[PDB]
Structure 1
Amino acid sequence: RYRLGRKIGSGSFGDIYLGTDIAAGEEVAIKLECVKTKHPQLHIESKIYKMMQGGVGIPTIRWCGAEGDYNVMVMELLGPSLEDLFNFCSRKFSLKTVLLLADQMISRIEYIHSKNFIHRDVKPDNFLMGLGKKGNLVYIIDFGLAKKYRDARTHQHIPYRENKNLTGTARYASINTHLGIEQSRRDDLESLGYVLMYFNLGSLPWQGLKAATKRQKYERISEKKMSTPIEVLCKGYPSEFATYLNFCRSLRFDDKPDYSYLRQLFRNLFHRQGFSYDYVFDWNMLK
């Protein structure tokens, strides 16, 4: 039912192609999982996307099972990542673009939380703009590290746990993630806070820090992050950014975040600046 076109991306558990859904007559993205291992990841990712179906800015998927030496997931075809678009804008976004993005990104994370998952990989690479009719819509992708933080029926929160190892990308990790604490809803939002200040600054002060051979590879990132006050990180930017990060850092392990407070904080700033909620992003002005 599918025709595979040109490769458009590579991921930790396989590659993303342009494809045709022959029955639907629509162009789609097709994720192929080649190396299964004993614990293949694509079928699990598809099951999390199924529980997120009906979410705005969550790609619609079709689990297709095996073909030859591949597992197949057909996805809504999306546009450039926010990391790609940041590079295209010379690694500066206007305050207006950062606030337009913040408004959607809080809502996307809230939606995932509402379906009893935490994302745990919040970074600009994993937010993609839509194409065509959905060009103004921020999507979130990559549920490869996503976890249930509560039972689907009980809403009994996962237990507190420490002594965990940090794996993958630390640039946007929460301070508690550096400290080996179990991730929960607060950590996704603290990560988003570092993403927003990254868009403001062009980089983060701990970005690209390398440890000595033999040392834990993240120790220089962790030390800089913990020794950089929020007020120093956010110096020269509207107070709302510091307010956002202080609020996230204050949340207890099992606390339900006040998403509406964080959105309204940025909305009030948007109004004080006299910005129009027009979805005219910096990249729309590129010539």
Structure 2
Amino acid sequence: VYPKALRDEYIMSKTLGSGACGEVKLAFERKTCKKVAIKIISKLNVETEIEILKKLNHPCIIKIKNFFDAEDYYIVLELMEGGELFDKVVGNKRLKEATCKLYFYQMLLAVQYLHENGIIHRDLKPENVLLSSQEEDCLIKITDFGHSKILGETSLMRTLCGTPTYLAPEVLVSVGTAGYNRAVDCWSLGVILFICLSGYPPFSEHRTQVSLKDQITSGKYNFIPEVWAEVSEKALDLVKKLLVVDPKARFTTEEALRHPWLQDEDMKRKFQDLLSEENESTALPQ
């Protein structure tokens, strides 16, 4: 059964999604009679995922409404009635280029916000992008921070304050590449954008003898001209700057937000319109 404290505040309804380690249910908040989503996770832990998310405040990142630590973990959030982006790209389906741009711009803003706040997501994929409604033109939010990591003063930074009389060479060599952990999120964004634009994955074991690992480390994505002929050259140029193998040469979220593909005032106006529509503000002086 559901725990008493949850049942006290919410009436539980149908499953909206399920799968590995958890489930998402529709529920109704008793006080307001409004729909919420409840994520159930079976017993980074959930507690610290919760702590990270309570500190963040961006319209394209999920917020926690409530939390119950019982036999299982129950996390209450606002219902994203559109569900997972995954369902929009599965089975070779693809989105209009304009719709990809709208969604991708929002993902970039969300991930840029994470990286400014010292957080790396590390599991960005279409399953972890939620859509606010069933219309094509909608707001998205990034979810599932179970793999996320907090950036801070590293062991390396502390080591380098002393004299390295006794320090192993590999630690000194690691100085060249440290502090670029966030670039893993930029690579994932690149893969997501590729899937959205094209309807198919850049790296997969489908009809090839090159191992998935070799495909990825060489950066040689499967390019199928006929699928891409309908997609603009600017869109593909961005994909190529995100799927760079050298993490230091890879586009950051900032570089991506300044790329010509995203200098689209129509797209931006649509986003702003969707934001104000979503929001329920108090009165304002002047």
Q: State the TM-score, normalized to the length of structure 2.
A: 0.68
Alpha carbons 2:90, 2:199 under 8 Å: kept: no
Q: What is the alpha-carbon distance in structure 1 between the residues aligned to residue 155 and residue 77 of structure 2? A: 30
Measured against aligned partners, the alpha-carbon deviations of 1:105-145 in whole angstroms (never above 9, x if no partner) come to 11011112222111111111111111389972111011111
The correspondence for 1:33, drawn from 26, 33, 41, is 41
Change (3 A) 1:159 1:194: farther
Other-structure match for 2:281: none
Shift of 1:99: 1.6
The correspondence for 2:86, drawn from 83, 90, 106, is 83
Shift of 1:264: 2.6
Shift of 1:225: 2.6
After superposition, where does 1:101-120 map in structure 2 within 5 Å?
A: 101-120=103-122
Other-structure match for 2:213: 222
State the AA in 2 paired with 1:260.
E
Change (3 A) 1:209 1:261: same
Q: Does 1:46 align with 2:50?
A: yes
The correspondence for 2:255, drawn from 237, 257, 261, is 261
Q: What is the alpha-carbon distance in structure 1 between the residues aligned to residue 54 and residue 101 of structure 2? A: 30
Q: What is the alpha-carbon distance in structure 2 between the residues aligned to residue 76 and residue 134 of structure 1? A: 19
Which moved further from structure 2: 79-88 or 14-23? Answer: 79-88
Q: What is the alpha-carbon distance in structure 2 between the residues aligned to residue 32 and residue 190 of structure 1? A: 29
Measured against aligned partners, the alpha-carbon deviations of 1:148-184 in whole angstroms (never above 9, x if no partner) come to 1x22xxxx35759xxxxxxxxxxxxxxxxxxxx9971
RMSD over equivalenced CA pairs, Å: 3.8
Change (3 A) 1:134 1:238: closer
State the AA in 1 paired with 2:193.
L
Change (3 A) 1:252 1:159: farther
Other-structure match for 2:248: 252
Q: State the TM-score, normalized to the length of structure 1.
A: 0.68
Measured against aligned partners, the alpha-carbon deviations of 1:33-89 in whole angstroms (never above 9, x if no partner) come to 33x1xx8x332322221122x21122221343334x22221111112211212248x
Change (3 A) 1:223 1:262: same
SS of 1:61's equivalent in the other structure is coil
Alpha carbons 2:110, 2:142 under 8 Å: kept: yes
Alpha carbons 1:43, 1:63 under 8 Å: kept: no
Alpha carbons 2:11, 2:30 under 8 Å: kept: yes
The correspondence for 1:23, drawn from 7, 26, 31, is 31
Change (3 A) 1:182 1:258: closer
Q: Does 1:242 align with 2:242?
A: no
State the AA in 2 paired with 1:22.
R
After superposition, where does 1:174-253 map in structure 2 within 5 Å?
A: 184-209=181-206, 220-229=211-220, 236=229, 237-246=232-241, 249=244, 250-252=246-248
Percent of residue pairs bearing the same amino acid type: 22
Unaligned 5+ runs, structure 2: 1-8, 158-177, 274-286
The correspondence for 1:66, drawn from 63, 69, 91, is 69
Alpha carbons 1:186, 1:248 under 8 Å: kept: no
Alpha carbons 1:198, 1:204 under 8 Å: kept: yes
State the AA in 1 paired with 2:64.
I
Change (3 A) 1:205 1:251: closer
After superposition, where does 1:149-160 map in structure 2 within 5 Å?
A: 150-151=151-152, 156=153
SS of 1:197's equivalent in the other structure is helix
State the AA in 2 paired with 1:222.
K
Q: What is the alpha-carbon distance in structure 1 between the residues aligned to residue 136 and residue 235 of structure 2? A: 28
Change (3 A) 1:21 1:134: farther
Shift of 1:21: 1.7
Other-structure match for 1:147: 149
Q: What is the alpha-carbon distance in structure 2 between the residues aligned to residue 185 and residue 196 of structure 1? A: 17
